[PDB]
Motif scaffolding. Structure first.
Motif, mmCIF file in Angstrom:
data_model
loop_
_atom_site.group_PDB
_atom_site.id
_atom_site.type_symbol
_atom_site.label_atom_id
_atom_site.label_comp_id
_atom_site.label_asym_id
_atom_site.label_seq_id
_atom_site.Cartn_x
_atom_site.Cartn_y
_atom_site.Cartn_z
ATOM 1 N N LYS A 19 51.630 32.207 6.485
ATOM 2 C CA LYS A 19 52.113 31.265 5.450
ATOM 3 C C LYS A 19 53.501 30.703 5.837
ATOM 4 C CE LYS A 19 52.583 33.252 1.263
ATOM 5 N NZ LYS A 19 51.093 33.211 1.302
ATOM 6 N N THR A 22 52.368 28.132 8.745
ATOM 7 C CA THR A 22 51.611 26.972 8.235
ATOM 8 C C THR A 22 52.465 26.173 7.244
ATOM 9 O OG1 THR A 22 50.617 28.339 6.445
ATOM 10 C CG2 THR A 22 49.318 28.127 8.494
ATOM 11 N N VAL A 25 50.634 26.056 2.055
ATOM 12 C CA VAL A 25 49.188 25.742 2.088
ATOM 13 C C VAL A 25 48.697 25.274 0.702
ATOM 14 C CG1 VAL A 25 48.266 27.048 4.142
ATOM 15 C CG2 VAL A 25 48.785 28.308 1.995
ATOM 16 N N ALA A 55 45.945 29.977 11.878
ATOM 17 C CA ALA A 55 46.937 29.032 11.356
ATOM 18 C C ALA A 55 46.365 27.606 11.317
ATOM 19 C CB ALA A 55 48.205 29.079 12.210
ATOM 20 N N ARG A 56 45.641 27.234 12.401
ATOM 21 C CA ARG A 56 44.987 25.915 12.534
ATOM 22 C C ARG A 56 43.928 25.726 11.447
ATOM 23 N NH1 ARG A 56 45.885 24.401 18.434
ATOM 24 N NH2 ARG A 56 46.680 26.313 19.396
ATOM 25 N N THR A 59 45.409 25.719 7.782
ATOM 26 C CA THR A 59 46.036 24.408 7.619
ATOM 27 C C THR A 59 44.958 23.325 7.440
ATOM 28 O OG1 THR A 59 48.111 24.921 8.821
ATOM 29 C CG2 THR A 59 47.347 22.606 8.928
ATOM 30 N N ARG A 60 43.870 23.446 8.225
ATOM 31 C CA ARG A 60 42.748 22.505 8.195
ATOM 32 C C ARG A 60 42.043 22.559 6.841
ATOM 33 N NH1 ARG A 60 39.484 20.028 12.734
ATOM 34 N NH2 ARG A 60 37.657 19.089 11.737
#
Length: 70
Positions: A19, A22, A25, A55-56, A59-60
């Motif tokens: 968190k 990123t 979120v 993380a990707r 975030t996505r």
């Protein structure tokens, strides 16, 4: 054997690190289910070595329509 990219030993450490990496979120009620899915069911958010992959993908999820409430 899965490499721990981190130093301290804690359960909420994974969420804390991620968190901070990123940012805010801020997952919607829908995204809360989708979070539990891609967090507990993938190798990315299961493995501490795959912090970058996790993380990707988190975030996505956060940029997905169901989370991204304008």
């Amino acid at each position: 054997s899965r490499s721990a990219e981190i130093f301290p030993r804690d359960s909420n450490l994974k969420d804390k690190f991620i968190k901070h990496f990123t940012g805010p979120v801020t997952f919607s009620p829908e995204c809360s289910k989708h979070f539990h899915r891609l967090y507990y069911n993938t190798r990315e958010c299961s493995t501490p070595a795959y912090y970058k992959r996790c993380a990707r993908l988190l975030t996505r999820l956060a940029v997905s329509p169901l989370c991204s409430q304008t």
